[PDB]
């Protein structure tokens, strides 16, 4: 099948400003390339066909050129609404096939997470397992890393990450880190700690309790 | 207007057998070529299959991936497409648009989805746990809604009144089939001492609803 490499996997837009993202194929597929738009919990919806044409409804500031493998999508100053996943398509030869899409995010300045931790109840104890929970409060980039030490032993394939939508009032994100231990696992060490390394941070931020103390 | 409406997602095991059903309308149903799209995390978008017009012989195409197993058939007199599909695999999994294809070109009409969900794991409720504000300005606190089968499941604070700083975290499948998510919320500290902190977990599915009180633990 024709491969169609989409970048950037995230592009970060401030409001008004003109951006633009890239779709290019594995081969040559002349002008047969067609943009689609996708809001959060949405269909999606086509803006751009045979690479330049704009279908009648979608605004001016939707643009798209290119031919052969190269492909742009261009939005002349981004409005609110453009906060969407993008994906393109072609249908040169059979086949069609999409990318895996630009998701459009909004872009301000950094803010630091607020961490905290959390050691597994009491009542999740007696039930043979031990979930500990590491927060990151609204914080901005997304990117950040969260690594759990335990009794100072690096922990590796035992936590899962999950991640907010962008918040609709500040445009930060907020992450969980869990890590899992079985309740005999769980019982063998002290110290649990989180520490996290973020771009609003002067230094990375550890939180860590002793296990059974308050 | 054209309008395409989806029906018949659901829950199945591995091996098992669905039906999809799409309407149409808002156009010549019978001149134009009908095609599945489908959308997952993991693969993006995929087209599925596609039925062409009766003009030529209402031709049948399937995505590699699902040839032998999936067929895709139209009934013109009641301007609907159908996806029926056996043998059933988790990597099946995902949600399943109805879309027009304008003549071997653009998908230019989309319906809203329907979701297809393949897994052997049983339905079950999820388990609350409290994640109880430090002992040590603003404090964090929560309910862990751990092991329950399948989505969704809803999670509200103090009956709907509280709103304000709440992070619901999406659900996370675990390796034993089950999902399990966060709900968090930041308050005052001050206010630890005069405010009560419930959260209200309901799962549909095993018609389950639990209210855990969450508090400083001693």
Known sequence: ?214 | EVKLEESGGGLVQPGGSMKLSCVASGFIFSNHWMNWVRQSPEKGLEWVAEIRSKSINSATHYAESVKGRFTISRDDSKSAVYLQMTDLRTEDTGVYYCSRNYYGSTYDYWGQGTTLTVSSASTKGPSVFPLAPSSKGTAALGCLVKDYFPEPVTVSWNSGALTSGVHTFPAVLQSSGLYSLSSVVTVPSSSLGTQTYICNVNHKPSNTKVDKKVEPKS
């Not at chain 1, 890239?22 to 943009?35: D, E, N, P």
């Not at chain 1, 066909?49 to 002349?76: C, H, Q, V, W």
């Not at chain 1, 630009?102 to 300045?109: A, I, Q, S």
């Open chain 1, 1 to 214: 099948d024709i491969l169609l490499t989409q970048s950037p996997a995230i592009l970060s837009v401030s409001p008004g400003e003109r951006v633009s993202f890239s779709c290019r194929a594995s081969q040559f597929v002349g002008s047969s390339i067609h943009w689609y738009q996708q809001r959060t919990n949405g269909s999606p919806r086509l803006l751009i066909k045979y690479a330049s044409e704009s279908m009648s409804g979608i605004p001016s500031r939707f643009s798209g050129s290119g031919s052969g493998t190269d492909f742009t999508l261009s939005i002349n100053t981004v409005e609110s609404e453009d906060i969407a996943d993008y994906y393109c398509q072609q249908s040169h030869s059979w086949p069609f096939t999409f990318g895996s899409g630009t998701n459009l995010e909004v872009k301000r300045t950094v803010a630091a997470p607020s961490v905290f931790i959390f050691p597994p109840s009491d009542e999740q104890l007696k039930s043979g397992t031990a979930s500990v929970v590491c927060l990151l409060n609204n914080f901005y980039p997304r990117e950040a890393k969260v690594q759990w030490k335990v009794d100072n032993a690096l922990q590796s394939g035992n936590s899962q990450e999950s991640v907010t939508e962008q918040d609709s009032k500040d445009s930060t994100y907020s992450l969980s880190s869990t890590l899992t231990l079985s309740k005999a696992d769980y019982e063998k060490h002290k110290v649990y700690a989180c520490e996290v390394t973020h771009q609003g941070l002067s230094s990375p931020v550890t939180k860590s309790f002793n296990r059974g103390e308050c």
